[PDB]
Amino acid sequence: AIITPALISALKTSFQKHFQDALATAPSTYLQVATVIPSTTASNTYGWLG
Amino acid sequence: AIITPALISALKTSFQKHFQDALATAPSTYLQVATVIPSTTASNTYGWLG
């Protein structure tokens, strides 16, 4: 006649991490639509002739 | 010739086991819809991070 706190609830229970980091995020797709340009200062300026 | 119909008429037979295992049962399928998580106590508690 063990008291409920020390029962299947807590005393008899094993922790498992099968659900961890299983639901993923949508795959990255920004490369297909955008291109990467590096920078090394506060801003970047672009110019073309015509 | 003449004989009781409970000895010869009963023993003039050849038992065969063709009918055994003639049919089958539906194949296992729960693998395609479930994973197997072994347990070592009364219950298993699961926890994952957000």
Numbering used by the authors:
A (entry chain B), B (entry chain C): 2 to 51
Quote from the publication:
Bacteriophage Casadabanvirus JBD30, from the order Caudoviricetes, is a temperate phage that infects the bacterium Pseudomonas aeruginosa. The virion of bacteriophage JBD30 is composed of an icosahedral capsid, long flexible non-contractile tail, and a baseplate. Using its baseplate, JBD30 attaches to Pseudomonas aeruginosa via the bacterial type IV pilus, whose subsequent retraction brings the phage to the bacterial cell surface.
Here we present the structures of the virion and empty particle of siphophage JBD30 resolved using cryo-electron microscopy. The icosahedral capsid of bacteriophage JBD30 is built from 415 copies of major capsid proteins organised in a T7 laevo lattice. The capsid of JBD30 is formed by pentamers and hexamers of major capsid proteins. Unlike in phage HK97, there are no covalent bonds linking the capsid proteins to each other. The positioning of annular loops extending from the axial domains leaves openings in the centre of hexamers (7 Å radius) and pentamers (6 Å radius). These pores were suggested to serve for water and ion passage during genome packaging and ejection, and putative scaffold protein release during capsid maturation. The empty JBD30 particle remains associated with the cell wall.
